[PDB]
Design an enzyme around this catalytic site. Structure first.
Site, PDB file in Angstrom:
ATOM      1  N   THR A   9      -5.723  -7.531  10.286  1.00 64.46           N
ATOM      2  CA  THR A   9      -5.906  -6.658  10.017  1.00 64.46           C
ATOM      3  C   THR A   9      -5.667  -5.457  10.915  1.00 64.46           C
ATOM      4  OG1 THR A   9      -8.151  -7.548   8.388  1.00 64.46           O
ATOM      5  CG2 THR A   9      -7.469  -5.029   8.208  1.00 64.46           C
TER       6      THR A   9
ATOM      7  N   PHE B 162     -15.880   5.299   7.899  1.00 65.18           N
ATOM      8  CA  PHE B 162     -14.189   5.145   7.103  1.00 65.18           C
ATOM      9  C   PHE B 162     -13.660   5.540   5.467  1.00 65.18           C
ATOM     10  CE2 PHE B 162     -15.465   0.880   8.556  1.00 65.18           C
ATOM     11  CZ  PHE B 162     -14.716  -0.133   7.907  1.00 65.18           C
TER      12      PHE B 162
ATOM     13  N   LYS C 194       0.829  -0.960   0.107  1.00 65.12           N
ATOM     14  CA  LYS C 194       0.378  -0.283  -0.154  1.00 65.12           C
ATOM     15  C   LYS C 194       0.358   1.686  -0.224  1.00 65.12           C
ATOM     16  CE  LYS C 194      -4.241  -2.260   2.303  1.00 65.12           C
ATOM     17  NZ  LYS C 194      -4.753  -2.093   3.939  1.00 65.12           N
TER      18      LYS C 194
ATOM     19  N   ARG D 113      -1.742 -14.905   3.597  1.00 62.34           N
ATOM     20  CA  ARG D 113      -2.460 -14.269   4.798  1.00 62.34           C
ATOM     21  C   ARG D 113      -2.161 -14.742   5.807  1.00 62.34           C
ATOM     22  NH1 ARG D 113      -6.824 -16.651   6.628  1.00 62.34           N
ATOM     23  NH2 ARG D 113      -9.001 -15.343   6.864  1.00 62.34           N
TER      24      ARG D 113
ATOM     25  N   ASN E 132      -1.731  -0.173   7.380  1.00 62.46           N
ATOM     26  CA  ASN E 132      -1.063  -1.407   7.555  1.00 62.46           C
ATOM     27  C   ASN E 132      -0.281  -2.348   6.439  1.00 62.46           C
ATOM     28  OD1 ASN E 132      -3.234  -1.861   5.725  1.00 62.46           O
ATOM     29  ND2 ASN E 132      -4.648  -3.578   7.499  1.00 62.46           N
TER      30      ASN E 132
ATOM     31  N   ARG F 288       2.444  -7.015   8.636  1.00 66.07           N
ATOM     32  CA  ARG F 288       1.619  -6.338   9.547  1.00 66.07           C
ATOM     33  C   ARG F 288       1.494  -5.977  11.090  1.00 66.07           C
ATOM     34  NH1 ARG F 288      -4.060  -8.348   6.901  1.00 66.07           N
ATOM     35  NH2 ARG F 288      -3.670  -6.603   5.543  1.00 66.07           N
TER      36      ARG F 288
ATOM     37  N   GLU G 200      -9.486 -10.400  -7.404  1.00 69.28           N
ATOM     38  CA  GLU G 200      -8.567  -9.211  -7.650  1.00 69.28           C
ATOM     39  C   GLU G 200      -7.978  -8.853  -8.201  1.00 69.28           C
ATOM     40  OE1 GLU G 200      -6.997  -9.257  -2.706  1.00 69.28           O
ATOM     41  OE2 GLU G 200      -9.087  -9.016  -2.466  1.00 69.28           O
TER      42      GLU G 200
ATOM     43  N   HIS H 206      -1.841  -5.528   1.331  1.00 71.63           N
ATOM     44  CA  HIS H 206      -3.189  -7.037   1.423  1.00 71.63           C
ATOM     45  C   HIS H 206      -2.799  -7.963   0.964  1.00 71.63           C
ATOM     46  CE1 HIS H 206      -6.894  -7.945   0.036  1.00 71.63           C
ATOM     47  NE2 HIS H 206      -6.296  -8.274  -1.653  1.00 71.63           N
TER      48      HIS H 206
ATOM     49  N   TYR I 272     -12.920  -1.772  -2.924  1.00 74.17           N
ATOM     50  CA  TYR I 272     -13.049  -2.002  -1.446  1.00 74.17           C
ATOM     51  C   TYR I 272     -14.621  -1.926  -1.545  1.00 74.17           C
ATOM     52  CZ  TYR I 272      -8.514  -1.071   0.090  1.00 74.17           C
ATOM     53  OH  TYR I 272      -7.369  -1.302   0.745  1.00 74.17           O
TER      54      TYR I 272
END
Lengths: 139, 139, 139, 139, 139, 139
Positions: free
Chosen positions: B91, B57, B9, B85, B112, B102, B126, B115, B49
């Site tokens: 998260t 948010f 990110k 994952r 964070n 993370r 995705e 993803h 998203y």
């Protein structure tokens, strides 16, 4: 603002050295403003290595850059062309200074993990060759 | 065989963690079969998203994710979705285990760092959203 | 905002782990707002460990903690007390999870490399004990 | 026994390079015998950089060392002054050898992350300037 | 195919530098084809250091290589003798380039962490001295 | 005092992870008291894996373990068997926690990079099987 082209070669990619190389450039404070994993066509390889076409073993030089996925990337920052050249070190990994990417990882001239542009002139040529304008990202 | 989607990110990019993140996937033995630096468009950020579009948010998510360059990537290997994952962790970086991406780098639930698809289905959606087939690279 | 106290103990100092420890807090994005190398006095060591003063290992604690230099530090950020405790892990390094500081480096329950406040209250007491206000540094 | 002064400059501190720098000195076998996070006053900066006061852009040199927290530290060990100078590398990070702190991290002469004393003479002067006797710790 | 002898000396072993040293050789692409932790007898040490026997402090040189466990090892790969010499760096760690094992870790000439053969000739002699044929492993 | 047996398997050797693995044990403060690179014989591989000799993957185990060089080692310290098992993590790297050796590097249940004794008894059997007494080294 100054930009240079870097290619992580198929040996760098195949040996799992992509993160290590990128970390060295990020620690040094440079910006990645374009990057992609790709496979280099015959044509593109020959164009890329055009100045070598009358030199010994041109086709072994080409064969090799087409033998696997590379990471093509454009770095931006001050003195980037020259600073990246010194970080990568001498073409020959036996002669490349310790602490350089080629001194620390490169196995031979043919298997020397990474390429960075020589000069302002060849950066501009290599960037145009590998990337369209829209693939550059501002930050 | 099995593929997952990963996004580093804008906080991970802006903080200089691209290499470190990629190195954990390489040391783990996964194959990067597609990768690019990009700026995510408004529309791409909203489609990605979509499930959170009614949450208060959502603007914070979208503004953040389109606020700087990200690295988009496709990783391949056995159990890659599940394993990636686990490597990324929970998260909320406060809950993510130490040794996760993370847990070691994330600074808040929104910042964070990274993803990774959360299921087989999510990985297919995705990858389809972020890549055309021609950006996939066989080793 | 939220602050916690951290001490790199004399084993962590004598073994050459100060940088590594500090790097985990920096990579995590915390702000060091106070820091110093010091020798802990007998009195400071007893006030710090006051709760254990009736335990038969109290001399082992005190003699160890005042046996060489420590690094005392104040860290700031969201959930810093809780997050730092998780990063440090369980008191006994045998029980601390891998990826924690104590799990990766601690060698015994007494030589466990590092301390971090265990609650909000404990952090206020400890910061007050180890630092005068003038040693706090706004970024 | 020989001692030198090191300052991790505000850019080193702000970019999260404190652990990395310290690790390089600890791996090399040196002892930290004094260390603190602090903010440098105007007066102290001018005194520190007194020999530069008639040189170009003196005040930009001063402005910058006061623009954020630094880590002041004293290292002890054999040939420490000279060995630390070589580990830090040339003032200009483009010219600093790869493997040096400035070659690997420094962005420019003004943003070159770290300072170490020049000479036995300037170490003694810089140590006295930044530290009282009681802040030195024996080990 | 070319081979060289490396000894991680007792200071390298005692300071926990064995993994770090090996990683540098594995990252560089060399093969370990023999390796063992051992204690060097008086006789073997004197034989190993025979060319130094009329030089100053011969016995301090011997005393030291017998003062603790070493790791004896044989590395194979192209230009291995010469490349390992440059990775290890100058005998004197103050003069050894940054990025070399001795520049980064060595404390002094006597405590310089590691030895690698000088020459094709001394590699063959040092390998025969430390290893029988059956201890070499093919891969 | 307490000893355990560790084997870096042929995948760990062939992928260039020997140093990294050894470094985790050194940073943890354990003492390597015996170590060697070896090729495991058919017979040694069958005695080691005797419990699995009726399982349908036994040929896959044996062919793998004797397929390239391994590093065999004996480690010593308080709770070494238990602590080393925790550092290595669960047999199946998909289940091993992040921060473990198997969690960070293992690629499958069979290619899981490393083995460590699972109990006191198993450690005695395994050390006896792999080492003669004369290969043990007092520090």
């Amino acid at each position: 603002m100054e930009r240079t082209f870097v290619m992580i070669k198929p040996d760098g990619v195949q040996r799992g050295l992509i993160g290590e190389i990128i970390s060295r450039f990020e620690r040094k404070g440079f910006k990645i403003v374009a990057m992609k994993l790709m496979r280099i066509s015959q044509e593109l390889a020959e164009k890329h290595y055009a100045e070598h076409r009358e030199k010994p073993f041109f086709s072994g030089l080409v064969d090799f850059i087409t033998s696997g996925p590379v990471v093509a990337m454009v770095l931006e920052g001050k003195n980037v062309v020259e600073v990246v050249r010194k970080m990568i070190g001498a073409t020959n990994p036996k002669e490349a200074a310790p602490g350089t990417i080629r001194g620390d990882f490169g196995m031979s001239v043919g298997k020397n993990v990474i390429h960075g542009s020589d000069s302002l002139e060849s950066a501009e040529r290599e960037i145009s060759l590998f990337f369209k304008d829209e693939e550059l990202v501002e930050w």
